[PDB]
């Protein structure tokens, strides 16, 4: 018996309850990035750059 | 018995309840990125860059 | 008995309940990217860049 | 135009979502009444005694 | 135009979301009444005694 | 236009979200009444005695 990483619970979302009666939502993007309404999300990354809700409006490398 | 990574629970979403009665939603994108309404998502990446809800409005490498 | 990665539960979404009574939704994209209404999604990537809901509005490499 | 009882919506159940993963259930009745697991039920009674989930363990009128 | 009882919404249950992962439930009745697990129920009674979840363990009228 | 009882919303339950992960429940009745787990219930009674979750353990009229 060694149990190196035996019984873990990592990157987990369990048990959620949500209501939304009258939620007007309005976005107007021009040349950018927009990230709305993210809920009950999970992940696990090994040897990588993991971003749940990133928003890079632009990337420019001119030469 | 070694149990190196034996019994894990990683990148998991279990147990969700959602309601939405009258949810007006309106988007208007022009030349960009938009990410709305993400729910109950999970993943696991090994040796990679895993992004759940990314939004890159542009990528430019001119020469 | 070694159990290297024996009994895992990774990249999983189990148990979801959803209702939506009167959900007006309206999108208007012009030359970009739009990602709406994502629910109950899962994946696992080994040696790769796995993105659940990405949105790249443009990619340009001019020469 | 009188509209005495014109456009009603009475005794109604509309819009339900349910999940049950591992629900052990065990009953043991002896000489009585048991009522379990009632969901999404509706009725309308006119000039009567309407009971959705009644449980009378006994009725005795000895003479 | 009189609209005596024209456009009503009475005795209504609309919009429900439920989850139950591992719900052990155990009843043991002896000579009585038991009423468990009632959900999303509606009714309308006119000129009557309407009881949704009643439980009368006994009724006795001896002579 | 009189609108005596025109546009009402009476005896209504709309919009509910519930979760229950590991809910052990155990009842043991002997000669009585028990009422557990009632949720999202509605009714309307006109000219009557309406009780949602009543529990009369006994009724006795001896002569």
Coordinates of C-alpha atoms in Angstrom, one line a residue:
Chain A
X1 CA 0.0 0.0 0.0
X2 CA 1.5 3.3 -1.2
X3 CA -1.4 5.5 -2.4
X4 CA 0.8 7.9 -4.3
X5 CA -2.2 9.9 -5.7
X6 CA -4.7 7.3 -4.9
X7 CA -8.1 8.8 -4.0
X8 CA -8.3 12.5 -4.9
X9 CA -11.2 14.7 -6.0
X10 CA -9.6 17.5 -8.0
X11 CA -11.1 20.0 -10.4
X12 CA -14.7 19.2 -9.4
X13 CA -18.0 21.1 -9.2
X14 CA -20.8 19.0 -7.6
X15 CA -24.1 20.4 -6.3
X16 CA -25.5 23.5 -7.9
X17 CA -29.0 25.0 -8.1
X18 CA -29.9 28.1 -10.1
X19 CA -32.9 30.1 -11.0
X20 CA -33.4 33.2 -13.3
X21 CA -36.8 34.7 -13.7
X22 CA -36.5 37.7 -16.1
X23 CA -32.9 38.4 -16.9
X24 CA -32.6 40.7 -19.9
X25 CA -29.0 40.6 -21.2
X26 CA -27.6 42.6 -24.1
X27 CA -24.1 42.7 -25.5
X28 CA -22.6 44.8 -28.3
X29 CA -19.0 44.0 -29.2
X30 CA -17.0 45.7 -31.8
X31 CA -13.6 44.2 -32.6
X32 CA -13.0 42.7 -29.1
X33 CA -13.8 39.8 -26.8
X34 CA -16.8 39.1 -24.5
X35 CA -17.4 36.2 -22.2
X36 CA -20.6 36.1 -20.2
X37 CA -22.7 33.6 -18.3
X38 CA -20.3 30.8 -17.3
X39 CA -21.5 28.4 -14.6
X40 CA -20.7 24.9 -13.3
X41 CA -17.4 24.4 -15.1
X42 CA -14.4 22.3 -14.2
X43 CA -11.2 21.0 -15.7
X44 CA -7.7 19.6 -14.9
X45 CA -4.6 20.2 -17.1
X46 CA -1.3 18.4 -16.7
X47 CA 1.7 20.2 -18.3
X48 CA -0.3 23.0 -20.0
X49 CA -1.7 26.4 -19.5
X50 CA -5.4 26.0 -18.7
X51 CA -7.6 29.0 -18.6
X52 CA -11.3 28.6 -17.9
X53 CA -12.7 31.9 -19.2
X54 CA -10.0 33.9 -20.9
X55 CA -10.7 37.0 -23.1
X56 CA -7.8 38.4 -25.2
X57 CA -9.2 41.2 -27.3
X58 CA -6.4 41.1 -29.8
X59 CA -3.0 39.6 -30.5
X60 CA -0.6 41.5 -32.9
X61 CA 2.9 40.6 -34.0
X62 CA 3.7 42.8 -37.0
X63 CA 7.0 42.7 -38.9
Chain B
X1 CA -0.9 -2.7 -4.0
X2 CA 0.6 0.6 -5.2
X3 CA -2.4 2.8 -6.3
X4 CA -0.3 5.3 -8.3
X5 CA -3.3 7.3 -9.7
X6 CA -5.8 4.6 -8.9
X7 CA -9.2 6.0 -7.9
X8 CA -9.4 9.7 -8.8
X9 CA -12.3 11.9 -9.8
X10 CA -10.9 14.8 -11.8
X11 CA -12.5 17.3 -14.2
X12 CA -16.0 16.4 -13.1
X13 CA -19.3 18.2 -12.8
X14 CA -22.1 16.1 -11.3
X15 CA -25.4 17.4 -9.9
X16 CA -26.9 20.5 -11.4
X17 CA -30.4 22.0 -11.6
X18 CA -31.3 25.1 -13.5
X19 CA -34.4 27.1 -14.4
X20 CA -34.9 30.1 -16.7
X21 CA -38.4 31.6 -17.0
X22 CA -38.2 34.6 -19.4
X23 CA -34.6 35.3 -20.3
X24 CA -34.3 37.7 -23.2
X25 CA -30.8 37.6 -24.6
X26 CA -29.4 39.6 -27.5
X27 CA -25.9 39.8 -28.9
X28 CA -24.5 42.0 -31.7
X29 CA -20.9 41.2 -32.7
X30 CA -18.9 43.0 -35.4
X31 CA -15.5 41.5 -36.1
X32 CA -14.9 40.0 -32.7
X33 CA -15.6 37.1 -30.4
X34 CA -18.5 36.4 -28.1
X35 CA -19.1 33.4 -25.8
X36 CA -22.3 33.3 -23.7
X37 CA -24.3 30.7 -21.8
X38 CA -21.8 28.0 -20.9
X39 CA -22.9 25.5 -18.2
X40 CA -22.1 22.0 -16.9
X41 CA -18.8 21.6 -18.8
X42 CA -15.8 19.5 -17.9
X43 CA -12.6 18.2 -19.5
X44 CA -9.1 16.9 -18.7
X45 CA -6.0 17.6 -20.9
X46 CA -2.7 15.9 -20.6
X47 CA 0.3 17.7 -22.2
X48 CA -1.8 20.4 -23.8
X49 CA -3.2 23.9 -23.4
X50 CA -6.9 23.3 -22.5
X51 CA -9.2 26.4 -22.3
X52 CA -12.9 25.9 -21.6
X53 CA -14.3 29.2 -22.9
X54 CA -11.7 31.2 -24.6
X55 CA -12.4 34.3 -26.8
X56 CA -9.6 35.7 -28.9
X57 CA -11.1 38.6 -30.9
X58 CA -8.3 38.5 -33.5
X59 CA -4.8 37.1 -34.3
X60 CA -2.6 39.0 -36.7
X61 CA 1.0 38.2 -37.8
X62 CA 1.7 40.4 -40.8
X63 CA 5.0 40.4 -42.8
Chain C
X1 CA -1.8 -5.3 -8.0
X2 CA -0.4 -2.0 -9.2
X3 CA -3.4 0.2 -10.3
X4 CA -1.4 2.7 -12.3
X5 CA -4.4 4.6 -13.6
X6 CA -6.9 1.9 -12.8
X7 CA -10.3 3.3 -11.7
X8 CA -10.6 7.0 -12.6
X9 CA -13.5 9.1 -13.6
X10 CA -12.1 12.0 -15.6
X11 CA -13.8 14.5 -17.9
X12 CA -17.3 13.6 -16.8
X13 CA -20.6 15.3 -16.5
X14 CA -23.4 13.2 -14.9
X15 CA -26.6 14.4 -13.5
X16 CA -28.2 17.5 -15.0
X17 CA -31.7 18.9 -15.1
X18 CA -32.7 22.0 -17.0
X19 CA -35.9 24.0 -17.9
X20 CA -36.4 27.1 -20.0
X21 CA -39.9 28.5 -20.4
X22 CA -39.8 31.5 -22.7
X23 CA -36.2 32.3 -23.7
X24 CA -36.0 34.7 -26.6
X25 CA -32.5 34.7 -28.0
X26 CA -31.2 36.7 -30.9
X27 CA -27.7 36.9 -32.4
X28 CA -26.4 39.1 -35.2
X29 CA -22.8 38.4 -36.2
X30 CA -20.9 40.3 -38.9
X31 CA -17.5 38.9 -39.7
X32 CA -16.8 37.4 -36.3
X33 CA -17.5 34.4 -34.0
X34 CA -20.3 33.6 -31.7
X35 CA -20.8 30.6 -29.3
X36 CA -24.0 30.4 -27.2
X37 CA -25.9 27.8 -25.4
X38 CA -23.4 25.1 -24.4
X39 CA -24.4 22.6 -21.8
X40 CA -23.5 19.2 -20.5
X41 CA -20.3 18.8 -22.4
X42 CA -17.2 16.7 -21.6
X43 CA -14.0 15.5 -23.2
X44 CA -10.5 14.3 -22.5
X45 CA -7.5 15.0 -24.7
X46 CA -4.1 13.3 -24.5
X47 CA -1.2 15.1 -26.1
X48 CA -3.3 17.9 -27.7
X49 CA -4.8 21.3 -27.2
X50 CA -8.4 20.7 -26.3
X51 CA -10.7 23.7 -26.1
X52 CA -14.4 23.2 -25.3
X53 CA -15.9 26.4 -26.5
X54 CA -13.3 28.6 -28.3
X55 CA -14.1 31.6 -30.4
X56 CA -11.4 33.1 -32.6
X57 CA -12.9 36.0 -34.6
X58 CA -10.2 35.9 -37.2
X59 CA -6.7 34.6 -38.0
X60 CA -4.5 36.5 -40.4
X61 CA -0.9 35.8 -41.6
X62 CA -0.3 38.0 -44.6
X63 CA 3.0 38.1 -46.6
Chain D
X1 CA -68.6 39.4 -25.1
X2 CA -69.0 38.2 -21.5
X3 CA -66.1 35.8 -20.8
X4 CA -67.7 34.2 -17.7
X5 CA -65.0 31.6 -17.2
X6 CA -63.5 32.0 -20.7
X7 CA -59.8 31.5 -20.8
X8 CA -58.5 29.9 -17.6
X9 CA -55.6 27.5 -16.9
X10 CA -56.6 25.6 -13.7
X11 CA -55.2 22.5 -12.2
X12 CA -52.1 22.4 -14.5
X13 CA -48.5 21.2 -14.2
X14 CA -46.4 22.1 -17.2
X15 CA -42.6 22.1 -17.4
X16 CA -40.7 19.5 -15.2
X17 CA -37.3 18.0 -15.4
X18 CA -36.1 15.2 -13.0
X19 CA -33.1 13.0 -12.5
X20 CA -32.3 10.2 -10.1
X21 CA -29.0 8.4 -10.2
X22 CA -28.9 5.7 -7.5
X23 CA -32.1 6.0 -5.3
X24 CA -32.5 2.9 -3.1
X25 CA -36.0 2.9 -1.8
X26 CA -37.5 0.3 0.5
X27 CA -41.0 0.1 2.1
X28 CA -42.4 -2.4 4.6
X29 CA -46.1 -2.0 5.3
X30 CA -48.1 -4.1 7.7
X31 CA -51.8 -3.4 7.8
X32 CA -51.6 0.2 6.8
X33 CA -51.2 2.6 3.9
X34 CA -48.2 4.0 2.1
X35 CA -47.9 6.5 -0.7
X36 CA -44.5 7.3 -2.1
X37 CA -43.0 8.9 -5.3
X38 CA -45.8 11.1 -6.6
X39 CA -44.8 13.7 -9.3
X40 CA -46.3 15.8 -12.0
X41 CA -49.9 15.2 -11.1
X42 CA -52.9 17.5 -11.7
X43 CA -56.7 17.3 -11.5
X44 CA -59.9 19.4 -11.2
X45 CA -63.0 18.3 -9.4
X46 CA -66.4 20.1 -9.6
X47 CA -68.8 19.2 -6.7
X48 CA -66.7 16.5 -5.2
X49 CA -64.0 15.8 -2.6
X50 CA -60.8 15.5 -4.6
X51 CA -57.6 14.3 -2.8
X52 CA -54.4 13.9 -4.8
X53 CA -52.4 11.6 -2.5
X54 CA -54.6 10.5 0.5
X55 CA -53.6 7.6 2.9
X56 CA -56.3 6.3 5.3
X57 CA -54.7 3.4 7.2
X58 CA -58.1 2.0 8.2
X59 CA -61.8 2.7 8.4
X60 CA -63.9 0.9 10.9
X61 CA -67.7 1.2 11.7
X62 CA -68.6 -1.7 13.9
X63 CA -72.1 -2.5 15.2
Chain E
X1 CA -66.8 42.9 -22.2
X2 CA -67.3 41.7 -18.6
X3 CA -64.5 39.3 -17.8
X4 CA -66.1 37.7 -14.8
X5 CA -63.4 35.1 -14.2
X6 CA -61.9 35.4 -17.7
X7 CA -58.2 34.9 -17.7
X8 CA -57.0 33.3 -14.5
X9 CA -54.1 30.9 -13.7
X10 CA -55.1 29.0 -10.6
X11 CA -53.8 25.8 -9.0
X12 CA -50.7 25.7 -11.2
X13 CA -47.1 24.5 -10.9
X14 CA -45.0 25.3 -13.9
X15 CA -41.2 25.2 -14.0
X16 CA -39.4 22.7 -11.9
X17 CA -36.0 21.1 -12.0
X18 CA -34.8 18.3 -9.6
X19 CA -31.8 16.1 -9.0
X20 CA -31.2 13.3 -6.5
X21 CA -27.9 11.4 -6.6
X22 CA -27.9 8.8 -3.9
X23 CA -31.0 9.1 -1.8
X24 CA -31.5 6.0 0.4
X25 CA -35.1 6.0 1.7
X26 CA -36.6 3.5 4.0
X27 CA -40.1 3.4 5.6
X28 CA -41.6 0.9 8.0
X29 CA -45.3 1.4 8.8
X30 CA -47.4 -0.7 11.1
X31 CA -51.1 0.0 11.2
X32 CA -50.8 3.7 10.2
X33 CA -50.4 6.0 7.2
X34 CA -47.2 7.3 5.5
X35 CA -46.9 9.8 2.6
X36 CA -43.4 10.6 1.3
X37 CA -42.0 12.1 -1.9
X38 CA -44.7 14.4 -3.3
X39 CA -43.6 16.9 -5.9
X40 CA -45.0 19.1 -8.7
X41 CA -48.7 18.6 -7.8
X42 CA -51.7 20.9 -8.4
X43 CA -55.4 20.8 -8.4
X44 CA -58.6 22.9 -8.1
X45 CA -61.8 21.8 -6.3
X46 CA -65.1 23.6 -6.5
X47 CA -67.6 22.8 -3.7
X48 CA -65.5 20.1 -2.1
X49 CA -62.8 19.4 0.5
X50 CA -59.6 19.0 -1.5
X51 CA -56.5 17.8 0.4
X52 CA -53.3 17.3 -1.5
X53 CA -51.3 15.0 0.8
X54 CA -53.5 13.9 3.7
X55 CA -52.7 11.1 6.1
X56 CA -55.3 9.8 8.5
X57 CA -53.8 6.9 10.5
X58 CA -57.3 5.5 11.5
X59 CA -61.0 6.3 11.6
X60 CA -63.2 4.5 14.1
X61 CA -66.9 4.9 14.8
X62 CA -67.9 2.0 17.0
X63 CA -71.4 1.3 18.3
Chain F
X1 CA -65.0 46.5 -19.2
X2 CA -65.6 45.3 -15.7
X3 CA -62.8 42.8 -14.8
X4 CA -64.4 41.2 -11.8
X5 CA -61.8 38.6 -11.2
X6 CA -60.3 38.9 -14.7
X7 CA -56.5 38.3 -14.7
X8 CA -55.4 36.7 -11.4
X9 CA -52.6 34.3 -10.6
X10 CA -53.7 32.4 -7.4
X11 CA -52.4 29.2 -5.8
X12 CA -49.3 29.1 -8.0
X13 CA -45.8 27.8 -7.7
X14 CA -43.5 28.6 -10.6
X15 CA -39.7 28.4 -10.7
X16 CA -38.0 25.8 -8.5
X17 CA -34.6 24.2 -8.5
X18 CA -33.6 21.5 -6.1
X19 CA -30.6 19.1 -5.5
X20 CA -30.0 16.4 -3.0
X21 CA -26.7 14.5 -3.0
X22 CA -26.8 11.8 -0.3
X23 CA -30.0 12.2 1.8
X24 CA -30.5 9.1 4.0
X25 CA -34.1 9.2 5.3
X26 CA -35.8 6.7 7.6
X27 CA -39.3 6.6 9.0
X28 CA -40.8 4.2 11.5
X29 CA -44.5 4.7 12.2
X30 CA -46.7 2.7 14.5
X31 CA -50.4 3.5 14.5
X32 CA -50.0 7.1 13.5
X33 CA -49.5 9.5 10.6
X34 CA -46.3 10.7 8.8
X35 CA -45.9 13.2 6.0
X36 CA -42.4 13.9 4.7
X37 CA -40.9 15.4 1.5
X38 CA -43.5 17.7 0.1
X39 CA -42.4 20.2 -2.6
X40 CA -43.7 22.3 -5.3
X41 CA -47.4 21.9 -4.6
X42 CA -50.4 24.2 -5.2
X43 CA -54.1 24.2 -5.2
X44 CA -57.2 26.3 -4.9
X45 CA -60.5 25.3 -3.2
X46 CA -63.8 27.2 -3.5
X47 CA -66.3 26.4 -0.7
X48 CA -64.3 23.7 0.9
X49 CA -61.7 23.0 3.6
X50 CA -58.4 22.5 1.7
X51 CA -55.4 21.3 3.6
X52 CA -52.1 20.7 1.7
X53 CA -50.3 18.4 4.1
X54 CA -52.5 17.4 7.0
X55 CA -51.7 14.5 9.4
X56 CA -54.4 13.3 11.8
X57 CA -53.0 10.4 13.8
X58 CA -56.4 9.1 14.7
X59 CA -60.1 9.9 14.7
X60 CA -62.4 8.2 17.3
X61 CA -66.1 8.6 17.9
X62 CA -67.2 5.7 20.1
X63 CA -70.8 5.1 21.4

